[PDB]
Design a protein around this ligand. Sequence first.
Ligand SMILES: COc1ccc(-c2cc(NC(=O)Nc3cc(C(C)(C)C)nn3-c3ccc(C)cc3)[nH]n2)c(C)c1
Length: 263
Amino acid sequence: GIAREDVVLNRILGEGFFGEVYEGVYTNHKGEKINVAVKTCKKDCTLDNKEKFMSEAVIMKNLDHPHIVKLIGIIEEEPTWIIMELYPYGELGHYLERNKNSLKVLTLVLYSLQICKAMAYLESINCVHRDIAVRNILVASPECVKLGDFGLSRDEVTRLPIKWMSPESINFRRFTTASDVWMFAVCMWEILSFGKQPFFWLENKDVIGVLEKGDRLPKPDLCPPVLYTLMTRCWDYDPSDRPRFTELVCSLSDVYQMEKDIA
Ligand SMILES: COc1ccc(-c2cc(NC(=O)Nc3cc(C(C)(C)C)nn3-c3ccc(C)cc3)[nH]n2)c(C)c1
């Protein structure tokens, strides 16, 4: 559905692979104003690329998870626009950086559990994310985070998020649900560190050497010891020793309940 007259473009959000992404306002039947992200596609693209761009809307319309980004609509007629629901609080990493003096550890464990639930759903359909990081998570409200996949490296030199990747992904470009588990724990380290970048003290080329020797990201200051134990299991060199997301949901819910009881 959705007529173009209902959508007003306001400012450029950023540059996507296929074209610019705009911040906008969608007015529905009730006259309610919904903040939106409007994804565009270059007119001179190949039919194959126009198909790949539109495939996001065809796929995303089937996703209705509370912790996954929401598709509002698609305007098929040229210029073809994909209309995503905008989360004005923005990316979680920047949000954590701004609110570091008021955020409680229970809230950081809550966000980790919400993303784990989103990943447990993707795991159930044998899909891989391959870019799990705090920059791909949006804050719908202080009580709800939403997982997206909108990085310029994208259903599933560098370019690649080396500092978040498993050793099999860095060495052989192997990406499995087990490699997503490794990346997810790197994302949890970013959350518990209030948006710090993993391995900020190294260059990309030093990462593999450090991992092969047995070194790992240190426990963030406010990270509960039991949560850090779970992160280290996700960082096992052997992918078969990493937990599945479905079981990690159970372990994270246990940590959340443990933290709530103390709080
Ligand atoms: C500030 O508020 C904002 C609101 C929304 C956005 C935003 C979201 C997206 N799209 C997106 O996240 N797609 C997605 C998610 C996933 C899983 C389900 C998480 C894996 N898969 N794919 C996917 C991508 C491409 C293809 C072909 C198929 C699927 N673009 N922009 C932004 C930037 C800001």
